[PDB]
A paper describes a structure:
Here, we crystallized and determined four additional structures from the CVB3, rhinovirus B14 (RVB14), and rhinovirus C15 (RVC15) REPLRs using a Fab-assisted RNA crystallography approach. Despite being crystallized in different conditions and space groups, the crystal structures of RVB14 REPLR showed remarkable similarity with the CVB3 REPLRs, including the Py–Py base pairs, sD dinucleotide bulge, and the sC–Py–Py tertiary interactions through the A•C•U base-triple formation. Intriguingly, with the formation of U43•G76 and U46•G76 wobble pairs, the RVB14 and RVC15 REPLR crystal structures showed a single-nucleotide bulge with flipped-out A44 and A47, respectively. Notably, such an arrangement forms 2 bp between the 4WJ and the bulge in all these structures, suggesting that a single-nucleotide sD bulge is sufficient for the 3C binding, which is consistent with our 3C binding studies with the CVB3 REPLR. The mFold predicted secondary structures suggest that whereas RVB14 contains a UAU tri-loop, unlike an sD tetraloop present in all other enteroviral REPLRs, the RVC15 and PV1 were expected to form the sC pentaloops (CACGU), unlike a triloop found in other enteroviral REPLRs. While the length of the sB helix is longer for CVB3 (9 base pairs) and RVC15 (8 bp) compared to that for RVB14 (7 base pairs), which may have implications in PCBP2 binding (discussed later), the sB loops seem more dynamic with the highest crystallographic B-factors. Similarly, the sB helix of some REPLRs, such as in RVB14, is shorter than others, such as in CVB3 and RVC15. Although the H-shaped topology is preserved across enteroviral REPLRs that position the sB loop and 3′SP on the same side, the more extended 3′SP in the RVB14 REPLR perhaps compensates for its shorter sB helix precisely posing the two PCBP2 binding sites for high-affinity interactions. Interestingly, the lowest-energy models for RVB14 and RVC15 superimpose well with their corresponding crystal structures.
Residue numbers in the entry:
A (entry chain L): 1 to 215
B (entry chain H): 4 to 228
RNA sequence: GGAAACAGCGGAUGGGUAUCCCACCAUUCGACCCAUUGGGUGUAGUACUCUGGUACGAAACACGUACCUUUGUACGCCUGUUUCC
C-alpha cells in the first residue's frame, strides 16, 4: 500500500574528486520508477536522474543512477565543488509518492580556527529592558565548536542560543553566533561578561570579553 | 522558458484555510500532471498532492487527504491547492512541480516553482526591532574588526538583511533564525571590516520583514569612547 | 458419394456390443485449460465478445487507438456416428 524509501547516508563529508555513492532502498518493488533530485539551500530541487538510470538533459555525465532489485544508487564519479547539496530519491511507482529523507553532502577542507568577537548590548535595547550579548565565531572548519559564557567567572547555562551558517560557497567554513539573554536587571548586577571558545584549531581556549559599561 | 510561479502563502491560524496557486507559463498544464510537494523548515521533501491530465483524477498524501483539494484551471493555465483545517505540522515551503513528458523524463518532476512559505500558528504577526553590533572600541586585533545588526523578536519568518542596499556583499554572514522561548524569532547579521576606517564609513543594514510590511535601516558606529 | 442430424482430452473396469479390432455405454479414475457452487479440452482458422495485459496518443487512473491474452458465441474446416438418399 504505502512504500517507504530508505536513503543512506543522511550526511556525507567528502573531498573534491571523491567518488560519491548514495543509496536508496525501496521497502517493496517500485520497478524502475525512481528519480533523483539535487537541492541547494533556499532553492527548489532540480531533477538529475529519471526512470532509475536515465540522465536528465543538461545534467553533467559524472552523475549516474542504477537499480538492482529494490536498491537504487546515485553515483557522482568525481565530486565537484558545485555538487555540494542535499540529494533526494523519489518513487513514483504508486500513489502516494515517497521521497527519501535526503543525503546532505558537504566538502572537507583543512582545519580553520575561528576568529572571535564579543558584542555588548546597545543602549537602545537597554531602553526596552532586555540585554543581548553576542559572540561571533567567524570562518572555521570543522563545524564542531564549543562556546561557554561566563559572568564574573560564574558559568552560564540555558540562557544562550546558537546559530550556524551553512558551509560557505568558497572557503567551505562555517560561522556561529551565540546570544546570551538576560534581563537588564541581571545585566547590571554583574561586572565581567566573557565568551570562551574551544575548537580543534585552537591549542588553548580563546577568550573575548568586556567590562560592563566601558564606553 | 517553462516557469511555475507560486503565490498565496502566508500565516494562518490552526483550523484556518488558505489557497495556493501555481501560475504556469511557457507550457500548458492541461498536457501534464501537476504536483505539490512541501518541505518543513529543515526537513526533507514531502509529496502532498497531484492532479492527472485529461481525467482530472486527484491524489493526496495520507495526512492531507480530505482536508486539501487540488485543482487546475486550464482557462487560466493555473493550478491550485486549497488547504482547509490547517494544523501546525502543515507549516512548510510549498512547491508546485511539473511531472515531465512520459517520453522525455519518465515521471521525474522536471520543473519546479520557487516555493511559497505557509506558517500555521496562533501567534500574531510581529515586526522586528533592529539593534547594532557595535565595532571594536579597542585597538586592532588581527588588522580587522567585526560589526553587524541584531534583528530580534519578529514573527513569522522570514527576515532578509542586506548591507548598503546590497552594494556591500563580500564577507557578510546572516545567521539562521533562532526561535526564542517567547515564541518569536531573532537573528543576527554580521560583517567583518577593516577596523582602521570604522568611523569614516557608512554601514547601513537593510532589514526587510515583508509579513509586517517593515523595512528598517540602521547606521553602525562605535560609541563615545 | 450425396445431403441431413449429433458429437469430439486420457485411462481402467465393467456392462452389454463387438464378438477381433471396432465401435457403444456405465462407472470410477485421471490430465490439461479457465474468469472454480461451475465450465471448457478435433481445429495453430476467421470475426465478434468478454477476462487480464503490452504500447502509444503532451496521457501512471479515466478516455481513445493498436496489439496480445482469456471467456464465450457464431462461421469455416477435419474427424467420426447415425439416419436416410
Amino acid at each position: 500500500s504505502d512504500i517507504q524509501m530508505t536513503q543512506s547516508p543522511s550526511s556525507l563529508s567528502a573531498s573534491v574528486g571523491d567518488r560519491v555513492t548514495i543509496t536508496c532502498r525501496a521497502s517493496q518493488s517500485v520497478s524502475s520508477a525512481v528519480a533523483w533530485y539535487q537541492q541547494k539551500p533556499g532553492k527548489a530541487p532540480k531533477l538529475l536522474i529519471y526512470s532509475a538510470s536515465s540522465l536528465y538533459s543538461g545534467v553533467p555525465s559524472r552523475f549516474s543512477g542504477s537499480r538492482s532489485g529494490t536498491d537504487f544508487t546515485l553515483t557522482i564519479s568525481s565530486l565537484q565543488p558545485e555538487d555540494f547539496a542535499t540529494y533526494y530519491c523519489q518513487q513514483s511507482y504508486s500513489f502516494p509518492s515517497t521521497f527519501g529523507q535526503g543525503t546532505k553532502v558537504e566538502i572537507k577542507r583543512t582545519v580553520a580556527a575561528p576568529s572571535v568577537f564579543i558584542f555588548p548590548p546597545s543602549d537602545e535595547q537597554l531602553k526596552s529592558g532586555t540585554a543581548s550579548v553576542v559572540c561571533l565565531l567567524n570562518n572555521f572548519y570543522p563545524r564542531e565548536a564549543k562556546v561557554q559564557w561566563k559572568v564574573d567567572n560564574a558559568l552560564q547555562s540555558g540562557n544562550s542560543q546558537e546559530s550556524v551558517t551553512e558551509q560557505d560557497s568558497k572557503d567551505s567554513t562555517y560561522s556561529l553566533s551565540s546570544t546570551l539573554t538576560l534581563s537588564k536587571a541581571d545585566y547590571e548586577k554583574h561586572k565581567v561578561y566573557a565568551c570562551e571558545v574551544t575548537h580543534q584549531g585552537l591549542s588553548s581556549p580563546v577568550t573575548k570579553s568586556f567590562n560592563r559599561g566601558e564606553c | 522558458e517553462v516557469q511555475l510561479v507560486e503565490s498565496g502563502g502566508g500565516l494562518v491560524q490552526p483550523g484556518g484555510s488558505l489557497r495556493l496557486s501555481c501560475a504556469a507559463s511557457g507550457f500548458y498544464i492541461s498536457y501534464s500532471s501537476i504536483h505539490w510537494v512541501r518541505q518543513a523548515p529543515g526537513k526533507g521533501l514531502e509529496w502532498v498532492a497531484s492532479i492527472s491530465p485529461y481525467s482530472g483524477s486527484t491524489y493526496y498524501a495520507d495526512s492531507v487527504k480530505g482536508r486539501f483539494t487540488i485543482s487546475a484551471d486550464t482557462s487560466k493555465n493555473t493550478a491550485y491547492l486549497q488547504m482547509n483545517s490547517l494544523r501546525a505540522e502543515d507549516t512548510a515551503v510549498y512547491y508546485c512541480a511539473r511531472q515531465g513528458y512520459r517520453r522525455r523524463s519518465g515521471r521525474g518532476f522536471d520543473y519546479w516553482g520557487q516555493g511559497t512559505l505557509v506558517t500555521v500558528s496562533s501567534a500574531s504577526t510581529k515586526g522586528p526591532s533592529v539593534f547594532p553590533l557595535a565595532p571594536s572600541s579597542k585597538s586592532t586585533s588581527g588588522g580587522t574588526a567585526a560589526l553587524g545588526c541584531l534583528v530580534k523578536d519578529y514573527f513569522p519568518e522570514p527576515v532578509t538583511v542586506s548591507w548598503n542596499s546590497g552594494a556591500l556583499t563580500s564577507g557578510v554572514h546572516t545567521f539562521p533564525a533562532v526561535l526564542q522561548s517567547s515564541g518569536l524569532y531573532s537573528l543576527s547579521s554580521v560583517v567583518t571590516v577593516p577596523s582602521s576606517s570604522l568611523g569614516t564609513q557608512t554601514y547601513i543594514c537593510n532589514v526587510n520583514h515583508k509579513p509586517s510590511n517593515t523595512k528598517v535601516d540602521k547606521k553602525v558606529e562605535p560609541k563615545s569612547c
